[PDB]
Amino acid sequence: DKKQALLEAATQAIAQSGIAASTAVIARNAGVAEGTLFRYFATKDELINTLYLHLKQDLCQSMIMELDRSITDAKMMTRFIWNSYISWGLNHPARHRAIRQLAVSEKLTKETEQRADDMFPELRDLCHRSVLMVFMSDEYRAFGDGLFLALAETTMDFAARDPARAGEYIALGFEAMWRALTRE
């Protein structure tokens, strides 16, 4: 049970302070000693990796549960995926702030990145058919993920702060994202 309390606490501290969040802070917010956090996670980088995989699985499980297989137009399908991404972030603001900082941290291992793609393999396929070539490359995929997350978090933030127009920010955000990242 302590491992979960550690993830939860790290989720919260990283959302507010990014990866520079203190391990001593995370341990006590979880109700455990820092020395115990390091028995679960030998390094802070190992914590970073496990937390990313944990938040990732949760996000993908939530999107898969809303995935309508009847939708057959690519843009509509990506639109409903986006809505589902935004809705998860709106229901879990800290988990999304944390996942975004983790996702762009350069501390994720190759096994983590590799293991990350295989939770929703078809969503992954869908990208290689829509996304701009440059944003699929080894050099710039990470940047393309960063650009997508910045668009998403900004859409989440305006929807949260002015809910009367949530559905308008989310649709405008999607359209902006679609033009930014996808092929002609």
Which residues in this chain contact ligand CVI in the complex, by CB under 6 A?
A: 56, 59-60, 63, 78, 81, 84-85, 99, 103, 123, 127, 131, 145, 148, 181
Q: CB 16 → ligand CVI: shortest distance, Å?
A: 18
47 binds, among a copy of itself, ligand CVI, none (CB under 5 to 8 A by kind): none
Interacting partner of 26 out of a copy of itself, ligand CVI, none (Cβ under 5 to 8 A depending on kind): none
Partners of 175 in the β-ladder: none
Which pair of structure tokens corresponds to residue 177? 């994202």
Q: CB under 5 to 8 A by kind: which of ligand CVI, a copy of itself, none does 99 bind?
A: ligand CVI
Name the site residues for a copy of itself (rule: CB under 8 A): 104, 106, 134-135, 139-140, 142-143, 146-147, 149-151, 153-154, 157-158, 161, 165, 168-169, 172-173, 176-177, 179-181
**177 and 79 Cβ atoms separated by less than 8 Å:** no
H or E segment to which residue 149 belongs:
helix 141-161
CA distances for 156 relative to 44, 81, 84, 148, angstroms: 29, 14, 11, 12
CB 34 within 8 A of CB 27: yes
Tokens of 33: 């000693």
